[model samples]
Target chain A: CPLEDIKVNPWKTPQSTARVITLRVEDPNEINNLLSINEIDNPNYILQAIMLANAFQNALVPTSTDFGDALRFSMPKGLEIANTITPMGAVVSYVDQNVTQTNNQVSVMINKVLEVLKTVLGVALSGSVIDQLTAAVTNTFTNLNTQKNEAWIFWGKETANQTNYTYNVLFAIQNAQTGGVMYCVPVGFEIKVSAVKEQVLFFTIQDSASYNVNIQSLKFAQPLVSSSQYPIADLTSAINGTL
Target chain B: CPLEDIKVNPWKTPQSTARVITLRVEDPNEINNLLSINEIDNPNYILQAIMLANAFQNALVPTSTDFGDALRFSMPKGLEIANTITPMGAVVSYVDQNVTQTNNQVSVMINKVLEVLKTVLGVALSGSVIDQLTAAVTNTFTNLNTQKNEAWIFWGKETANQTNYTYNVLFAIQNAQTGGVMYCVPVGFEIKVSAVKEQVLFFTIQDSASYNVNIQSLKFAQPLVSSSQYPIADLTSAINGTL
Candidate 1:
């Protein structure tokens, strides 16, 4: 059949993928300090911050519509919030296949994700609460603009392992003086979308797809200090310590 | 002498100084190809482009006002502009004991230089001509935005010898795929500014200062194409070839 000649464009489509977006900070430790201080005084804000962070990360690498088998990974057992009231963590999961995006397109997607988060949060929380959370997130992102800390973004996709597809989006805060990768938050997700399409008349219909997003594997870059080798204790510590 | 008790503020006033500014370009070969094509057809534009490139590079690294001995180096004999009608080439020269600058200050100085250039060029050249040249220079600088070529900027200073001062500014276009330094243009200059000043009530008298900027040591990063061992030829060839 003529359909046999058609093949998916890997650049525009991936069987399994991960996208990472990094936000460079002038002092990851400052962020950690802020998070730690708030941990005891403003626990809710910390939770909200984590939820927003997770949402922002997810939005940057949304589920794709491609074709393949779906493989769901598990998140750390205790961190799962299915029964909780708030989202406070991030994870990585795999799927079959998904669509492809250009660098510019990825940037646009990031903005879209941020906007969506604002909108959703605006509805879920009080105006003042949402505003505070927004400010915190916005300020964190804004640190990337300063002279001391510059933001670096990197994206890569690998299909070398036929069975395992890997896509990564890395967000890093780089120190201007050292030219070193300071803090990095790499988020990877794996999902599968169907390759085949059903046609009715001139309209093409995509297959219904579902995702197995594991909330476990998502993590911030470790060791806030580039020279140190200590494992960060918690989310706030990770925020303050690394990227 | 009382002068023995007084010390020059190294941060505010560096001795034995040089400031270098480099612009990273993607596909220097593309630029070389364009320049080569224009060399035969649009010689005036080419000359203007060269001048603008030189001016932009200079603007990025400005001469500082500090106290030191005045010295000037000479450019390579053939490329010397003293014998030419248009300034088509750039060179690096050295002097003993000059000024110092910080990265933030360097950025501010670059902008100031750009503004001054715009003001001066606006007066000298037609709006369209200046705009064309500006665009050309800007486009070259803008190439750093692409995915294939990432721009890296670094600054360093050394005493080289007790008598000779060396300041290095490295601008490198790095290839993301290979993590190689693709095209690097390191610029160094030499100069001396007066140190002595007299204050009487509200009025202050300053010593006269001078500079001898020679285009001598200006060269592209050697061993272009990370894995190969071939000296980059000329500037344009460096742009087009390995460097």
Candidate 2:
């Protein structure tokens, strides 16, 4: 056949398009193998890669918004109400006389138990409301007469030169039917003392056994002077006279 | 070389004995070529390797312990005192008259600003301390004509059947130096309307340019009646009476 007669196909087929396709595929096994070899040979490369991955992990992780939620949830329902008054890290200062010392060193402790109830009502209610409510509750609690022994149990055993002390007080709801420790609120207090004669008063609220406890610890720099020292014989009426 | 005479070097001339050493070596170029081919043939393998490397990178990273160091360093000094009250997300609720009204709807907006300063002191200090401090500060501020203007601005505008309204008040400290655009403290408050017709009042504190803004926004289900309606003729005495 003649070369020219080999009949060139004059109608070209779409310029003979050649498509360059890029296909990506991965094998986890090969990557694992490479990582293992790198571990034995050049360990620093593996360490660097691990560090980068950790940064991404930290950036992508989610964290809880409220740190106090766990503490709030673990508390009982009525106890939860107390949290509204006492913030998570709230503290109250209390002062107490050193039971063992005849000297002027007084014990100062921050109580958290009954302080919540005492402070909460005062802060939450108006002056008039507080006055009326406090009077009623005070009268009711006084009638029980159970708190009398506990109140005077302050100076228990006399030990000489005692510094660190731990005292525990139990409280229960005065009027409740199903009261076999339905809930417990631990009232703990931390203590500090002044080196010199400086009169101080400490007060705190703590929770205990479904009851609110108010622990008032007073410290006298020097033993308190009698009230008679400052008092003129009291008369009910106001005196409008020049001094 | 009989077997008995082969080890005649038992005198141990450093054990040279023409030892033949077999060694194994790898060409980095070959490893690189293999990796390139694998990448081309299965592009995903490269991606997987990269991701795996990223994971390792994250696992080995070190992170900062104190998040507040950066923030503290950037903030101004005395402004630091402001932070003691504004725990990152602390909020104070302010009750305001509804600024907008629709058919049978009232507009109420709660502004949480200077309220923290007013409330924070009371809450942060002991009751006795707050009593003395508040009395002094309140009297001093009340004397300032500036606050008086802000107080009356609340009810100045009069309109027939006007329901929606917005109010703005300014506050400034009495005396201070170096003051121009200081730190801002956010105070948020919640609102509650009485279900009955009992008279009540709400108050809050806010900060202004140079003074503590005492914001006293009052709301009445029905507009207030004249003071004379509830008053007994100008008499100051404690009288025991039955309602």
Candidate 3:
């Protein structure tokens, strides 16, 4: 009992305050010979192009049938198009040049809308894609009679023509009250359009009946100027008129 | 206490649910019409444009920059400009028509970087006065190129061309490992750029080293893309990379 009562002193190990001596591992200057040899065995651009067409149809085409202030020219809407074009250009410009696979992916991904646009406008567009896009847009506008009315719309396309890139065309009015807006939200889906369909099986407006009413072209009280005679260009002017 | 409680029970007084209530009211139609008129002046459109831009900038920009992806493109290592062209085009079309202000504010606010590109490319842009903004963006990009050589960088800008609606540009780029996706977030500051400068005694970011960076460009790139392509035109082809 007396032996057990003896006080035992516990030794405390000093908390090692010594910052672990870190040796700054310095590597001899070596060229960053980084290689991103992504296999070019990727999908043919056309296959991806078809998917893009379908995706646009499933996703954006509905805008024509939907109702929301967001799509109304008079309404202030915020659009977010995910992983579509702008950023892809940056990536293509910055990526490893050898990684054609990645570059190709970027190229294809960026033009999904354009593919859809190509289908929507019913134009067999090809060559200097953007220029062709501009031409297609001009043709679409011409066909739609957008210029005479001073109205404009927007479309996009991907091309391997003059430049291998995505070309987005805008058919916008230059006035204060006749144009449309679109949002591109960046999203990654195993299937772009299909993913949207799966995530949103059906999108319906609450007041489908009244909302479906189209306000057709409202006649302007005043005649347009000669400079604004071109439908697309005039539409651009009309839409931008207020601005 | 019971007597006092009973006295406080105003509802207990015979206000029967079934009692015929003959309340004289103004014409409901007139009231509804008035309400509709009130909605015409609703600041929702203007307010939403501003708020959405800010929100998108705050939430998506950081993620876009962090991942080194396109703010608009689903593809990795892409630039925001190319990715967002479609969306930006859409938004510009909408704002160009909706905002009832007869000025270049909206156009300049929407296409800040494009203005720069046009200027750099020596392309004469036709539109609102803001069309001249191309020069400013080109200058800012030039400044950014001089600042650093990091594989990836983030930045923003404010064009002086904006009067009522200011333009804000955001950008992000990834390292080569991520394919150096460059995301550009272009946002319109509905508030006048000059007014913002006047209101805020000291705007921190604008005063910082990376003031010329585009915040909107970065904001647009929150989503990710593994395959480097987006808007799968054909699911099989997107996966296989061949038609």
CA-lDDT, candidates in order: 0.24, 0.19, 0.21
Candidate 1 has a DockQ of 0.02
Return the TM-score for candidate 2, rounded to 2 decimals. 0.15
Model 3: CA > 4 A from native: A1-42, A48-210, A213-243, B1-106, B124-243
Winner on lDDT between 2 and 3 is 3
lDDT of 1 by residue, A1-243 (tens): 255766668675211111111111222332211111011111112222332233323223322324232222222321243224132222322122223323232233333333433343233221323322332333222211121111221112223321222222222222221122122222333422122111101111111222222221222222222211222123323333322
Q: What lDDT score goes with residue B123 in model 3?
A: 26
| Per-residue alpha-carbon lDDT of candidate 1 for residues B1-243, written as tens digits (9 for 90 to 100) | 254666657675211111111112222332211111011111112222232223223223333324132222222322233234132232222222223333232223233323433442333321323322332232222211121111211111213221212222222222221122122222333522122111101111111122222222222211222211222122233233322
Q: How close is every model to the real structure, measured as TM-score? A: 0.22, 0.15, 0.17
DockQ of each: 0.02, 0.02, 0.02
**Where is the poorest 10-residue window by lDDT in model 3 chain B?**
B31-40
Q: What's the true lDDT of residue B229 in model 2?
A: 21
Best model per lDDT: 1
Superposition error at A89 for model 2 (Å)? 31
Model 1 chain B weakest 10-residue run by lDDT: B35-44
Rank the candidate models, highest lDDT first. 1, 3, 2
